[PDB]
Amino acid sequence: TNFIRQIIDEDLASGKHTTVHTRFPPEPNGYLHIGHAKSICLNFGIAQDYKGQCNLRFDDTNPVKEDIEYVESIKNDVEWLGFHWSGNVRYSSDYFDQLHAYAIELINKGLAYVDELTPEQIREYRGTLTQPGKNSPYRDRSVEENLALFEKMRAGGFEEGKACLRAKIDMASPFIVMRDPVLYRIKFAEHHQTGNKWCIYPMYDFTHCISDALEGITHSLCTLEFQDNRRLYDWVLDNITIPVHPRQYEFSRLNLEYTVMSKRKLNLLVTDKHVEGWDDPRMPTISGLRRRGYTAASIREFCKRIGVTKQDNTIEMASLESCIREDLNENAPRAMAVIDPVKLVIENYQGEGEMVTMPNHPNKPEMGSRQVPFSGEIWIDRADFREEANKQYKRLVLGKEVRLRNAYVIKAERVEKDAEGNITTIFCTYDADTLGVIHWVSAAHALPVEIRLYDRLFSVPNPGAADDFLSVINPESLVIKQGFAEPSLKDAVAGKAFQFEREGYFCLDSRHSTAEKPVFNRTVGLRDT
RNA sequence: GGGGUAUCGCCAAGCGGUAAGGCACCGGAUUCUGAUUCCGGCAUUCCGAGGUUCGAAUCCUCGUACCCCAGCCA
Ligand SMILES: Nc1ncnc2c1ncn2C1O[C@H](COP(=O)(O)O)[C@@H](O)[C@H]1O
Ligand SMILES: N[C@@H](CCC(=O)O)C(=O)O
């Protein structure tokens, strides 16, 4: 439960409503991000729990900032997350004729007029946070004039900025949004839905409440920055001929540590080419998280865990990681892959190799097992061999044994280095029948894999609060390795995650993996203390 | 000026009857993944100072801190 669901219950009980109808209204000016998934869960979740309806509406009132590529991806991510909208997808543009009719009601009623104050003058007449505003000299034209002037506007008779429709409210209101807010502005820009049928477009504050009322929304849910705006939302509806009056309730938006969550900033990383695109695995977008290997279920759990309140907050990365680790720990089938390989030869081994049985999930026999090839010329990760070191070190030492995962026990005895002193091969012996612990891969039956280790995008916890956020990017957000995986991974698919034993959870694709060279993304590492 | 929020390191229950839970953290037990799982621990105190009450984080008073608003953006 949360404050919003408690309000809903009170409405139901009293009889103010007998149904709940919510809506998710993103503007198509960018891709969706984890913050939007908080909004999706809230809105679609309430609808389902309360046996109601939730619409998907694209708030497309500003042609110059939107693209059809965005509407398609948004519908795509909403669906991927696991939610369904009520009826057709809606668009604010579907109401363009209605909005125009209503503005005419305001004019006829004396509550709107056509102003000719330039874009610079309007600000200068507006007042300040502590100084009231002043009336435009065009504020008192007659209904007849405004009607004619608005039509000139509609008919493309005015150049951009040359005129606008403003509401006639109170220029000395402590609420600045009520200081004669603009209703319509001129823009000769083709709209992704209406083409070039309109040259005048409605402002957000005029559009949103009217779209909500026509759709029959009962509870209009938005974030905290629209609190002041609720006053204008209520003014418009109270002043036109419409039968319902939806009520707005605001909650705090999500902030994630070590990342930016603003379309303008995310768009900048994309535009300046500092990430592959909106769906880059280091991006906080729904598509990037999907491509990273996150499960829609884990994102829904995250939103569930974080709550909905009016308190400004900033979630730590640990919280998100915990969610994906829970899902994958339970469902991901295990395998073997070596990110940083060094050759180890069991001079003691005779033959071209053999086959060993390995569980698909160590703690769940039900998931089955598989047969993996073993031999005397394998690959192990460098960090797993130490010629010396402490008592705590539980891995392979130059005078000690270890258990090879699901196989035999080996004992290091000799080693071999090169020019720069770097090692090239570790010679060991194995106990003919013995079956710390370390993972390995047989060099003969090994699949050449590209491994992409991802990390936090920015060097700082709050990159959005930096002068130049791009300068505080982490140069190690992506580090590409070349390793070896057990042959079974040959049949892996983009969309399935695996746990590379003793490393983390990885998944295919990355927009790159060919049949020849597979590319694997590290979704998240294992808990290491 | 106006609109909002202040409870554990990060989130968050609590709505006058005497501080839930999650992530994180510290111990110990299992474990052919130093993972998992598993027991135990972790606010005598709720931005501060007064007040009312048998009794308040929960009500009143006065402070303090932080967030949002001066786009013909949403
Ligand atoms: N960080 C965030 N946290 C919660 N909701 C958000 C966040 N960012 C955007 N939204 C929302 O997304 C919806 C509209 O998207 P937009 O127009 O693109 O801001 C709003 O109703 C909000 O719920
Ligand atoms: N378009 C608004 C919708 C929020 C609302 O007014 O409910 C937004 O970006 O948040």
Q: Per-residue b/e over A160-192, b at no fewer than 16 CB within 10 Å?
A: eeebbbbbbbebeeeeebbbbbbbbbbbeeebb
- Bases of strand B lying below 7 A from some protein CB: 1-7, 9-15, 21-26, 32-37, 66-74
Is there a catalytic annotation at residue A257?
no
Question: Three-state SS string across A20-40, please?
Answer: CEEEECCCCCCCCEHHHHHHH
Cα maximum dimension of chain A: 102
**What technique was this entry resolved by?**
X-ray
- With residues binned 3-state (H G I as helix, E B as strand, rest as coil), the percentages for chain A, rounded to 5, are 30, 25, 45
A115 strand-pairing partners? A164
Can you tell me whether residue A290 is helix, strand or coil? helix
Q: Among residues A27, A105, A401, A450, which one is catalytic? A: A27
Question: Three-state SS string across A414-441, please?
Answer: EEEECCCCCEEEEEEEECCCCCCEECCE
The separation, in Å, between residue A28 CA and nucleotide B26 C1' comes to: 48
Tokens 């409503």 found at: A17
Confirm whether any atom of chain B, the nucleic acid strand, is less than 7 Å from CB of A390: no
Nearest CA to ligand 2 atom 8: A26
Strands, E assignment, A396-496: 396-397, 401-404, 409-417, 423-430, 437-438, 441-442, 447-454, 478-485
Q: Which residues have C-beta within 8 Å of that of residue A232, sequence separation ≥ 6?
A: A167, A175, A177, A178, A181, A205
CA distance A180 to A136: 10
The separation, in Å, between residue A363 CA and nucleotide B25 C1' comes to: 27
Q: Can you list the domains of chain A with their CATH numbers?
A: 20-92+203-252 (3.40.50.620), 93-201 (3.90.800.10), 253-331 (1.10.1160.10), 332-339+447-529 (2.40.240.10), 340-446 (2.40.240.10)
Q: What is the DSSP letter of A130?
A: S
Question: Side-chain half-sphere of A168: how many Cα atoms within 13 Å?
Answer: 21
Among left, alpha and beta (phi > 0; psi -120 to 50; other), residue A87 is left
Token pair in block for residue A353? 């190799």
Q: Per-residue b/e over A207-227, b at no fewer than 16 CB within 10 Å?
A: bbbbbbbbbebbbbbbeeebe
CA distance A190 to A188: 7
Confirm whether any atom of chain B, the nucleic acid strand, is less than 7 Å from CB of A298: no
Confirm whether any atom of chain B, the nucleic acid strand, is less than 7 Å from CB of A311: yes
Query: How far apart are the CA of A223 and the centre of ligand 1, in A?
Result: 7
Is there a catalytic annotation at residue A292?
no
CA distance A246 to A153: 31
The separation, in Å, between residue A427 CA and nucleotide B41 C1' comes to: 47
Token pair in block for residue A520? 């694997």
Nearest CA to ligand 1 atom 2: A35
Nearest CA to ligand 2 atom 5: A222
Confirm whether any atom of chain B, the nucleic acid strand, is less than 7 Å from CB of A446: no
Residue A191 CB less than 6 A away from ligand 1: no
CA distance A236 to A213: 11
Contact A138, A113 (CB under 8 A): yes
Token pair in block for residue A286? 């729904």
Query: Taking Cα atoms as reference points, which of A424, A70, A515 lies closest to residue A263?
Result: A70
Residue A208 CB less than 6 A away from ligand 2: yes
CA distance A169 to A182: 11
Contact A12, A18 (CB under 8 A): yes
Q: Among residues A57, A168, A230, A263, which one is catalytic? A: A263
Strands, E assignment, A74-136: 90-91, 112-115
Is there a catalytic annotation at residue A197?
no
Residue A27 CB less than 6 A away from ligand 2: yes
Q: Which residues have C-beta within 8 Å of that of residue A304, sequence separation ≥ 6?
A: A41
Q: Which residues have C-beta within 8 Å of that of residue A371, sequence separation ≥ 6?
A: A355, A356, A357, A358
Identify residues after which chain A is interrupted (C–N over 2.5 A).
435
Q: Record the resolution, in angstroms.
A: 2.7
Residue A30 CB less than 6 A away from ligand 2: no
Token pair in block for residue A244? 């319902």
Atom of ligand 1 nearest to the CA of A263: 18
Confirm whether any atom of chain B, the nucleic acid strand, is less than 7 Å from CB of A110: no
- Calculate ∠ Cα A190-A192-A193, nearest 5°: 110
Alpha helices in A272-410 (DSSP H): 286-292, 296-306, 317-331
